[PDB]
């Protein structure tokens, strides 16, 4: 609350990743690390995990406390992309494939 920093610990998927009814994807994550409250590191990269694509819809997502749960809405581009949550080796890398309805 006083100092806003990026979470350094591990996240885990806490619900099936799924499509909304308005062309977006929702991901729920449990924060298992420390230093909370802290900001959830998250971005979407291309099929090569290189360039940043799509965008995050939710306002700056936070992990409020240890073992807290956070809902995140984002907008992957069409085709293959990777939702990367957290930093370092423990980072979650989730393959998403978006088709045209």
């Amino acid at each position, epitope marked *: 609350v006083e100092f806003k920093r990026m979470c350094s610990g591990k996240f885990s998927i806490d619900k099936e990743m799924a*499509e909304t009814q308005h062309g977006t994807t929702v991901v729920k994550v449990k924060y298992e690390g420390a230093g909370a409250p802290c900001k959830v590191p998250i971005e979407i990269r291309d099929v090569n995990k290189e360039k940043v694509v799509g965008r995050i819809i939710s306002s700056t997502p936070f992990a409020e406390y240890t073992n807290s749960v956070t809902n995140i809405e984002l907008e992957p581009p069409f085709g293959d992309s990777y939702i990367v949550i957290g930093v370092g080796d423990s980072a979650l890398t*989730l393959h998403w*494939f978006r088709k045209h*309805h």
Partner: antibody
Framework: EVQLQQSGPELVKPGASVKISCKAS????????MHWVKQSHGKSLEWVGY????????GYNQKFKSKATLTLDNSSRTAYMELRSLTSEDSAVYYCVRRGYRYDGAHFDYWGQGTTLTVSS | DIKMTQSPSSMYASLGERVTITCKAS??????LSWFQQKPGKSPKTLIY???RLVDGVPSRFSGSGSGQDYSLTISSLEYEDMGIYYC?????????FGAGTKLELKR
């Protein structure tokens, strides 16, 4: 029509392992996750885990993390659940059940016929 | 883990009557809730998902309602084939958890 066909009954000794299959048909396989569920005789249903068709999206109920290994084969539209270090407590009926993660998907609407596992010496 | 509590554990009814059974989550599950019916030695058959979406092919006498922590399944007019055990499932958060079931039996 949607169909989930599981492999037949299994009878093994304690310490052994088994691998139950669940072949799907009648829908776009990659648009659905496959969950596995345990039901001991006379007991409630219990979540084992699930598999998501892309990049080994794997979820384990922490209870089964040292017991089960879930896998997928998208090309054959077949899900597998492998149980190891078996004991009598593993004896139960196991089901596969699908869950659509797309905007137009249905949730847990079709189950497999179930697969009976009996562990004993 | 989210605890799912079904009430009642068992109950009796007569053909033609409305039956309502309930399922309460220990925390809000945002309508990520499904209902199933299961007969002895058979696999579960799904009635409802997303708390109120009727599964294609399932008779219209079954309906689902509720929100937050509380959910109800209602059979408007009980029929003979409706006997069995009904289960609820939350899939809002891992691990998925099931209620202990409600056994529905026939009066006489």
């Amino acid at each position: 029509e949607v169909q989930l066909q599981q492999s037949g009954p299994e009878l093994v000794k304690p310490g052994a392992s088994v691998k139950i299959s669940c072949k799907a048909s009648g829908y776009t396989f990659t648009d659905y996750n496959m969950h596995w569920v345990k039901q001991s005789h006379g007991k409630s249903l219990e979540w084992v885990g699930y598999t998501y068709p892309y990049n080994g999206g794997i979820g384990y109920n922490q209870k089964f993390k040292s017991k089960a290994t879930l896998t997928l084969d998208n090309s054959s539209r077949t899900a597998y659940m492998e149980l190891r270090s078996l004991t009598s407590e593993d004896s139960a009926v196991y089901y596969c059940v699908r869950r659509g993660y797309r905007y137009d998907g249905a949730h847990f609407d079709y189950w497999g016929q179930g697969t009976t596992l009996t562990v004993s010496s | 883990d989210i605890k799912m509590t079904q009430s009642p554990s068992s109950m009796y009814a007569s053909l033609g009557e409305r039956v309502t059974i309930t399922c309460k989550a220990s925390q809000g599950i945002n309508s990520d809730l499904s209902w199933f019916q299961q007969k002895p030695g058979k696999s579960p058959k799904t009635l409802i998902y997303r708390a109120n979406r009727l599964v294609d092919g399932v008779p219209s006498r079954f309906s689902g309602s509720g929100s937050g922590q509380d959910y109800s399944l209602t059979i408007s007019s009980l029929e003979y084939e409706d006997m069995g055990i009904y289960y609820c499932l939350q899939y809002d958060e891992f691990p998925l958890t099931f209620g202990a079931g409600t056994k529905l039996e026939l009066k006489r």
